[PDB]
Amino acid sequence: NSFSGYLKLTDNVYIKNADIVEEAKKVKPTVVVNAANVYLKHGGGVAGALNKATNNAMQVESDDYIATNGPLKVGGSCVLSGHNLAKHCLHVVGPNVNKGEDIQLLKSAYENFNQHEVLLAPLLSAGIFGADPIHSLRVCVDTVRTNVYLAVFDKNLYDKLVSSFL
């Protein structure tokens, strides 16, 4: 199957009201982005959902990556297997502004997307990371230069983002 049902916001940013796990299972994209933390502990939010859909195979692989490589930096990324969801999973760490991490690092986090021509992704630093999701979409539009297909689960949030960008 291929991406379908997206609204084009800019030349390269698309958005859909969808569960990213279901999108990944339908499309099997080359790259799905995870909203990760520095130790790749996929406990909740989008990370918990993607790891559960791999039946914990992502967590076991992530623990081995950390033991061998050490933690990521805030604003950084690594490429690991996508298992049943994608060819690859790009684990990206946005700042957790509720813990005083600098919002400037949200631009650095989105810069990692430019290494891939096409990605399925969530908004970074939204949810438990504490950033305003509309601000995160603005940074995505201002920073990502490759084609990104954004999945937003919550309908109320999705409608607010589309109203702000149209």
Query: Can you give the binding site for ligand A1CME, defined by CB under 6 A?
Result: 19-21, 45-46, 49, 122, 126-127, 133, 152-154, 157
To the nearest whole angstrom, how small is the minimum distance from the Cβ of residue 49 to ligand A1CME? Answer: 4
Chain position whose Cβ is nearest to ligand A1CME: 127
CA distance 4 to 68: 38
Checking phi first, is residue 15 left (phi over 0); if not, alpha (psi -120 to 50) or beta?
A: beta
| DSSP three-state, residue 77 | strand
| Spatial CA neighbour of 144 closest among 116, 111, 115 | 111
